[PDB]
Design an enzyme around this catalytic site. Structure first.
Site, PDB file in Angstrom:
ATOM      1  N   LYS A  11      12.424  12.873  19.390  1.00 29.09           N
ATOM      2  CA  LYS A  11      11.259  13.477  18.746  1.00 29.09           C
ATOM      3  C   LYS A  11      11.670  14.610  17.813  1.00 29.09           C
ATOM      4  CE  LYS A  11      10.047  17.055  22.156  1.00 29.09           C
ATOM      5  NZ  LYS A  11       9.131  17.396  23.274  1.00 29.09           N
ATOM      6  N   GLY A  12      10.692  15.221  17.149  1.00 26.20           N
ATOM      7  CA  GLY A  12      10.945  16.403  16.342  1.00 26.20           C
ATOM      8  C   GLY A  12      11.898  16.173  15.179  1.00 26.20           C
ATOM      9  N   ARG A  33      18.073  12.548  26.429  1.00 20.62           N
ATOM     10  CA  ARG A  33      18.264  12.614  27.878  1.00 20.62           C
ATOM     11  C   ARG A  33      17.355  11.674  28.672  1.00 20.62           C
ATOM     12  NH1 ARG A  33      15.913  18.685  29.255  1.00 20.62           N
ATOM     13  NH2 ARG A  33      13.973  18.493  28.032  1.00 20.62           N
ATOM     14  N   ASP A  59      22.418  13.759  28.034  1.00 17.91           N
ATOM     15  CA  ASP A  59      21.891  15.067  28.354  1.00 17.91           C
ATOM     16  C   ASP A  59      23.057  15.993  28.101  1.00 17.91           C
ATOM     17  OD1 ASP A  59      21.338  17.542  29.682  1.00 17.91           O
ATOM     18  OD2 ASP A  59      19.907  16.541  30.997  1.00 17.91           O
ATOM     19  N   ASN A  87      21.718  18.542  17.373  1.00 18.80           N
ATOM     20  CA  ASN A  87      20.322  18.894  17.141  1.00 18.80           C
ATOM     21  C   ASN A  87      19.578  19.368  18.391  1.00 18.80           C
ATOM     22  OD1 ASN A  87      17.512  18.535  15.712  1.00 18.80           O
ATOM     23  ND2 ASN A  87      17.431  17.229  17.547  1.00 18.80           N
ATOM     24  N   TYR A 225      17.406  32.650  23.053  1.00 22.99           N
ATOM     25  CA  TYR A 225      17.425  31.777  21.880  1.00 22.99           C
ATOM     26  C   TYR A 225      18.239  32.395  20.747  1.00 22.99           C
ATOM     27  CZ  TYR A 225      15.765  28.578  18.210  1.00 22.99           C
ATOM     28  OH  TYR A 225      15.676  27.629  17.228  1.00 22.99           O
ATOM     29  N   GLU A 259       7.003  20.070  18.346  1.00 18.98           N
ATOM     30  CA  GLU A 259       6.507  20.533  19.639  1.00 18.98           C
ATOM     31  C   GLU A 259       7.191  21.819  20.099  1.00 18.98           C
ATOM     32  OE1 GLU A 259       6.641  17.288  22.461  1.00 18.98           O
ATOM     33  OE2 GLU A 259       5.340  16.019  21.233  1.00 18.98           O
ATOM     34  N   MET A 260       8.357  22.137  19.539  1.00 19.09           N
ATOM     35  CA  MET A 260       9.007  23.408  19.874  1.00 19.09           C
ATOM     36  C   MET A 260       8.070  24.556  19.551  1.00 19.09           C
ATOM     37  SD  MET A 260      12.721  25.232  18.811  1.00 19.09           S
ATOM     38  CE  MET A 260      13.685  24.178  19.864  1.00 19.09           C
TER      39      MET A 260
HETATM   40  N1  LIG Z   1      11.199  23.589  15.005  1.00 19.24           N
HETATM   41  C1  LIG Z   1      11.665  24.793  14.338  1.00 19.24           C
HETATM   42  O1  LIG Z   1      10.917  25.503  13.759  1.00 19.24           O
HETATM   43  C2  LIG Z   1      13.153  25.087  14.291  1.00 19.24           C
HETATM   44  C3  LIG Z   1      14.105  24.278  15.156  1.00 19.24           C
HETATM   45  N2  LIG Z   1      15.558  24.559  15.108  1.00 19.24           N
HETATM   46  C4  LIG Z   1      16.466  23.769  15.917  1.00 19.24           C
HETATM   47  O2  LIG Z   1      16.216  22.366  15.633  1.00 19.24           O
HETATM   48  C5  LIG Z   1      16.714  21.622  16.789  1.00 19.24           C
HETATM   49  C6  LIG Z   1      15.635  20.599  17.186  1.00 19.24           C
HETATM   50  O3  LIG Z   1      14.452  21.334  17.408  1.00 19.24           O
HETATM   51  P1  LIG Z   1      12.943  20.643  17.333  1.00 19.24           P
HETATM   52  O4  LIG Z   1      13.001  19.263  16.841  1.00 19.24           O
HETATM   53  O5  LIG Z   1      11.964  21.657  16.520  1.00 19.24           O
HETATM   54  O6  LIG Z   1      12.409  20.729  18.874  1.00 19.24           O
HETATM   55  P2  LIG Z   1      11.725  19.538  19.732  1.00 19.24           P
HETATM   56  O7  LIG Z   1      11.191  20.363  21.039  1.00 19.24           O
HETATM   57  O8  LIG Z   1      10.634  18.819  19.071  1.00 19.24           O
HETATM   58  O9  LIG Z   1      12.904  18.487  20.157  1.00 19.24           O
HETATM   59  C7  LIG Z   1      13.937  18.968  20.975  1.00 19.24           C
HETATM   60  C8  LIG Z   1      14.870  17.779  21.208  1.00 19.24           C
HETATM   61  O10 LIG Z   1      16.008  18.266  21.978  1.00 19.24           O
HETATM   62  C9  LIG Z   1      15.997  17.462  23.179  1.00 19.24           C
HETATM   63  N3  LIG Z   1      16.574  18.191  24.283  1.00 19.24           N
HETATM   64  C10 LIG Z   1      16.086  19.398  24.990  1.00 19.24           C
HETATM   65  N4  LIG Z   1      17.041  19.666  26.073  1.00 19.24           N
HETATM   66  C11 LIG Z   1      18.074  18.626  26.033  1.00 19.24           C
HETATM   67  C12 LIG Z   1      19.236  18.320  26.889  1.00 19.24           C
HETATM   68  N5  LIG Z   1      19.495  19.116  28.052  1.00 19.24           N
HETATM   69  N6  LIG Z   1      20.085  17.190  26.554  1.00 19.24           N
HETATM   70  C13 LIG Z   1      19.815  16.335  25.386  1.00 19.24           C
HETATM   71  N7  LIG Z   1      18.593  16.584  24.589  1.00 19.24           N
HETATM   72  C14 LIG Z   1      17.773  17.720  24.914  1.00 19.24           C
HETATM   73  C15 LIG Z   1      14.535  17.169  23.460  1.00 19.24           C
HETATM   74  O11 LIG Z   1      14.468  16.101  24.359  1.00 19.24           O
HETATM   75  P3  LIG Z   1      13.122  15.954  25.300  1.00 19.24           P
HETATM   76  O12 LIG Z   1      11.981  15.168  24.423  1.00 19.24           O
HETATM   77  O13 LIG Z   1      13.613  15.118  26.613  1.00 19.24           O
HETATM   78  O14 LIG Z   1      12.647  17.280  25.720  1.00 19.24           O
HETATM   79  C16 LIG Z   1      14.140  16.749  22.076  1.00 19.24           C
HETATM   80  O15 LIG Z   1      14.651  15.468  21.781  1.00 19.24           O
HETATM   81  C17 LIG Z   1      16.877  22.665  17.900  1.00 19.24           C
HETATM   82  O16 LIG Z   1      18.224  23.001  18.047  1.00 19.24           O
HETATM   83  C18 LIG Z   1      16.122  23.862  17.401  1.00 19.24           C
HETATM   84  O17 LIG Z   1      16.595  25.075  17.925  1.00 19.24           O
HETATM   85  C19 LIG Z   1      16.083  25.623  14.219  1.00 19.24           C
HETATM   86  C20 LIG Z   1      15.132  26.429  13.353  1.00 19.24           C
HETATM   87  C21 LIG Z   1      13.667  26.157  13.402  1.00 19.24           C
END
Ligand SMILES: NC(=O)C1=CN([C@@H]2O[C@H](COP(=O)(O)OP(=O)(O)OC[C@H]3O[C@@H](n4cnc5c(N)ncnc54)[C@H](OP(=O)(O)O)[C@@H]3O)[C@@H](O)[C@H]2O)C=CC1
Length: 294
Positions: A11-12, A33, A59, A87, A225, A259-260
């Site tokens: 996602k995301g 994961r 994971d 990511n 963070y 969703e973050m």
């Molecule tokens: N959104 C923003 O505004 C910004 C985001 N970022 C960075 O972008 C990256 C992606 O963020 P974003 O898409 O917004 O967030 P999302 O919450 O939408 O997606 C997070 C993704 O990381 C996965 N994830 C969380 N924990 C683990 C784990 N232990 N092992 C493998 N996968 C994991 C989640 O899986 P699951 O669906 O199972 O939870 C999901 O696929 C992150 O590093 C974030 O810090 C940087 C600047 C701004």
């Protein structure tokens, strides 16, 4: 065909990175994961006519020995890895969903105001950070990146143009590193090592657990963070130095509607991913060790 691994791909930003790499002819290993979520994401892309995508469980907090299976899968089917996008990541805080949805509804998701208030105190009051969440945040955002990178380096070594792109945040800038000891370590670029960066991480976790966040001058909110991303940047620079064959960089995608952030942001997921993909697909003659848009 060049091939890529993307962590947190279900996602995301991660999902959109997988889609866009695929659109550019890259063979994409979408990893995440949750197995069900992984298969559904890949099925979704296939139904959208993206056929060069395959799922593999990952994971980033699992033991490096377990990741050997990803390494073997790539070697067996592809013979090398060209791109790793780190990511996967988490915020290190939870939110009161009911009140957050009310706040969003009230303001309207648009008018720069929503993004504006997301950073106000009115908003933090709806967010909760705890040691438990901090520890998990660092394990995923920092240690997880180290593990995945270590496991896949031998496959990237087999590429004629290996790239690692770490998805960072501008909140990881040294300007936001308040703790004096941490600032001294992370700001001494010439002396950066993985071991010294680990010290900063362990310092934060120890102070967090001992309720010393305010006392030792850490950021009053989001310390896990912002520290995890400042350490990710430093680790990215160390890795760039160690492996001059690779392009190793961070990209800060801007504030993205995922969703973050409970949907809040300046950019759509598609747009955020585009920012990362532009660096992942740099020409073979590309720089290494930098933090784009950070
Ligand atoms: N959104 C923003 O505004 C910004 C985001 N970022 C960075 O972008 C990256 C992606 O963020 P974003 O898409 O917004 O967030 P999302 O919450 O939408 O997606 C997070 C993704 O990381 C996965 N994830 C969380 N924990 C683990 C784990 N232990 N092992 C493998 N996968 C994991 C989640 O899986 P699951 O669906 O199972 O939870 C999901 O696929 C992150 O590093 C974030 O810090 C940087 C600047 C701004």
């Amino acid at each position: 065909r060049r091939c890529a691994v993307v962590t947190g791909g279900n996602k995301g930003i991660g999902f959109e990175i997988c889609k866009q790499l695929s659109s550019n002819g890259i063979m994409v290993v979408l990893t995440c994961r949750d197995v069900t979520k992984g298969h559904e994401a890949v099925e979704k892309l296939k139904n959208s006519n993206h056929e060069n995508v395959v799922f593999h469980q990952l994971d980033v907090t699992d033991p490096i020995a377990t990741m050997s299976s990803l390494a073997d899968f790539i070697k067996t089917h592809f013979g090398k890895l060209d791109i790793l996008v780190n990511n996967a990541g988490v915020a290190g805080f939870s939110v009161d969903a009911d009140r957050f949805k009310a706040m969003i509804s009230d303001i309207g998701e648009d008018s720069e105001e929503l993004v504006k208030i997301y950073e106000k105190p009115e908003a933090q009051e709806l967010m909760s950070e705890t040691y438990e969440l901090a520890e998990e945040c660092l394990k995923i955002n920092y240690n997880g990146v180290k593990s995945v990178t270590e496991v896949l380096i031998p496959l990237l070594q087999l590429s004629d143009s290996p790239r690692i792109v770490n998805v960072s945040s501008s909140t990881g800038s040294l300007k936001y590193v308040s703790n004096e000891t941490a600032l001294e370590i992370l700001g001494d670029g010439d002396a950066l090592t993985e071991e010294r960066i680990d010290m900063v991480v362990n310092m934060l976790l120890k102070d967090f657990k001992e309720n010393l966040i305010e006392t030792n001058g850490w950021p009053s909110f989001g310390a896990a963070y912002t520290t995890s991303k400042a350490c990710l940047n430093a680790y990215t620079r160390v890795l760039a130095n160690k492996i001059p064959k690779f392009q190793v960089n961070c990209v800060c995608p801007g504030l993205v509607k995922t969703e973050m952030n409970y949907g809040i942001g300046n950019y759509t997921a598609e747009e955020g991913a585009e920012h990362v993909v532009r660096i992942a697909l740099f020409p073979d003659d590309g720089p290494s060790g930098f933090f784009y848009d950070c």
